[PDB]
Amino acid sequence: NDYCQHFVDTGHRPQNFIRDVRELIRLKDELIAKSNTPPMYLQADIEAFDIRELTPKFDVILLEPPLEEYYRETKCWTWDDIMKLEIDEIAAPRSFIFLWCGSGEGLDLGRVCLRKWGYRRCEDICWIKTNKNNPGKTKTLDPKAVFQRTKEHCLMGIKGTANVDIDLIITEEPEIGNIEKPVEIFHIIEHFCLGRRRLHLFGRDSTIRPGWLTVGPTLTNSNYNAETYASYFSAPNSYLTGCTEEIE
Amino acid sequence: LFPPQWICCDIRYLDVSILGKFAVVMADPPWDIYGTLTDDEMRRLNIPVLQDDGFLFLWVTGRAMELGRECLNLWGYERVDEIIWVKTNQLQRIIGHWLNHGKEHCLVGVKGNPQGFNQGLDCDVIVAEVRSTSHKPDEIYGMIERLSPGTRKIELFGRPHNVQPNWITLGNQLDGIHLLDPDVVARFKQRYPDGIISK
Ligand SMILES: CC1(C)CCN(Cc2ccc(NCC3(O)CCN(c4cc(NCc5ccccc5)ncn4)CC3)cn2)CC1
Structure with missing residues (x-):
């Protein structure tokens, strides 16, 4: 079966036909839940906001700038803006980054960004979108596109010195104007x-x-306090992975 | 000449100027990440003479995700798409020190201003069964044929199972030289009158 031909024939994307899309080890999910800090969050206009106000330095940064391409039929950030973020100023010397790059020029400029901030790309995580509920909805293509674009990439980067998960996330394409990325x-x-x-x-x-500090221009409330936040990680809690028992 | 054609050769040393121009180039290089090519050898490949206007398909893995983008730009292409092949078994279930890998990547570059191609007929995800080791899915040839039907194509680092109609395949494990296009045959004998490919 050629699912590419089938997509041409019917409009059902090939990913519509991936299935499941005998061991469990989710004491880890429970350990993560026990170790998680209270949610913290700050409304902040990141273009106008000195990023260095965010302390201490972060072990993981998930960066989800609102690209224009996300608003097909709908303040966007360009890769010019994104590349000028001072992300190295807030990343811990050993730390990871996850950058949603979309499906166009971001696959290149997002790699420039990672290198500019001092990371090496170590994984490429693809969000593959099915259209099981809407086989008959043609895509309005980017002028440079050769193919219909049915996925987004989240690049993972590491700086400083497998397991259970795969480098793929498979969900149905969200409704028009829904910019959310999969919680997976x-x-x-x-x-x-x-x-x-x-x-x-x-x-x-x-x-x-x-377990997360969320910073963004559209938040309606804030509870962020730098001293309170730093106190979650002060001794004896400095080095924890978030996957180990809390210390008595 | 439409039927499959191929040249057993060392792609580092063949004079590819004798092959003419192609609507599509595909390469699955043995990146230095077996009989591989150093990064400098890859950069030096004479890809620019192969096309005036058209597309290049470049398979990449690991750090070749970045090196392949470097080569693509060095040879004069802009990367305009990225196909991923989700690897399945025969029952459509999915088969790198942080995540298990469910896919392979193929960069799509453009050179010049291609005219008359059928862009947007296929989507950028392939779902297909793994065959042998390092064997790319045959679905890519059908996607390329629908994109650019009837045109001349060239594959670099192909193996015998890769030979296809409308394609000229190059690789050092191919069986001899099999050329049917009269223009290529003429230029090949002029350039290689004794049938040997050396420096
Ligand atoms: C889609 C995937 C899963 C497919 C696999 N890819 C990685 C990959 C690509 C290719 C191969 N193998 C195929 C070849 O064997 C073909 C012929 N071939 C050469 C080489 C040469 N010059 C150098 C040279 C010559 C002699 C001695 C030393 C160096 N010139 C001409 N043909 C060497 C490669 C295996 N894996 C991952 C994605």
């Missing part, structure tokens, strides 16, 4: 057990999550 990206990130200082830049009220 948080599970992948948290399953790495990378440390407990987790920052989500350009998050929203709808993405606030225990």
Whole structure:
């Protein structure tokens, strides 16, 4: 079966036909839940905001700038803006980054960004969108596109010195104007057990999550306090992965 | 000449100027990440003479995700798409020190201003069964044929199973030289009158 030919024939994307899309080890999810800090969040206009106000330095940064391409039929950030963020100024010397790059020029400029901030790309996580509910909805293509674009990439980067998860996320394509990314990206990130200082830049009220500091222009409320936040990670809690028992 | 054609050769040393121009180039290089090519060898490949206007398909893995983008730009292409092949077994279930890998990547570059291609007929995800080791999915040839039907194509680092109609395949494990296009045959004998490919 050639699912590419079938897509040409019917408009059903090939990913519509991936299935499941005998062991469990989710004492880790429970350990992550026990270690998680209270959710913290700050309304802040990131273009106008000195990023260095965010302390201490972060172990994980999830960066989700609102690209124009997300608003097909709908303040966007360009890769010019994104590349000028001072992300190295707030990343811990050993730390990870997860950058949603879309499906166009971001696959290149997002790599420039990672290198500019001092990361090496170590994984390429593809969000593959099915159209099971809408086989008959043609895509309005980017002028440079050769193919219909049915996925987004979230690049993972590491700086400083497998497991359970795969480098694919498969969900149905969201409704028009819905910019949200699959929450499964948080599970992948948290399953790495990378440390407990987790920052989500350009998050929203709808993405606030225990174990995370969310910073973004559209948040309606803030509870961020730098001294309070730093106190979650002061001794004896400095080095924890977020995947180990709390210390008595 | 439409039927499959191929040249057993060392792609580092063949004079590709004898092959003419192609609507599509595809390469699945043995990146230095077996009989591989160093990064400098890849950069030096004479890809620019192969096309005036058209597309290049470049398979990449690991750090070749970045090196392949470097080569693509060095040879004069802009990357305008990225196909991923989700690897399945026969029952459509999915088969790198941080995540298990469910896919392979193929960069799509453009050179010049291609005219008369059928852009947007296929989508950028392939779902297909793994065959042998390092064997790319045959679905890519059908996607390329629908994109650019009837045109001349060239594959670099192909194996015998890769030979296809409308394609000229190059690789050092191919069986001899099999050329049917009269223009290529003429230029090949002029350039290689004794049938040997050396420096
Ligand atoms: C889609 C994927 C899963 C497919 C696999 N890819 C990685 C990959 C690509 C290719 C191969 N193998 C195929 C070849 O064997 C073909 C012929 N071939 C050469 C080489 C040469 N010059 C150098 C040279 C010559 C002699 C001695 C030393 C160096 N010139 C001409 N043909 C070497 C490669 C295996 N894996 C991942 C994605």
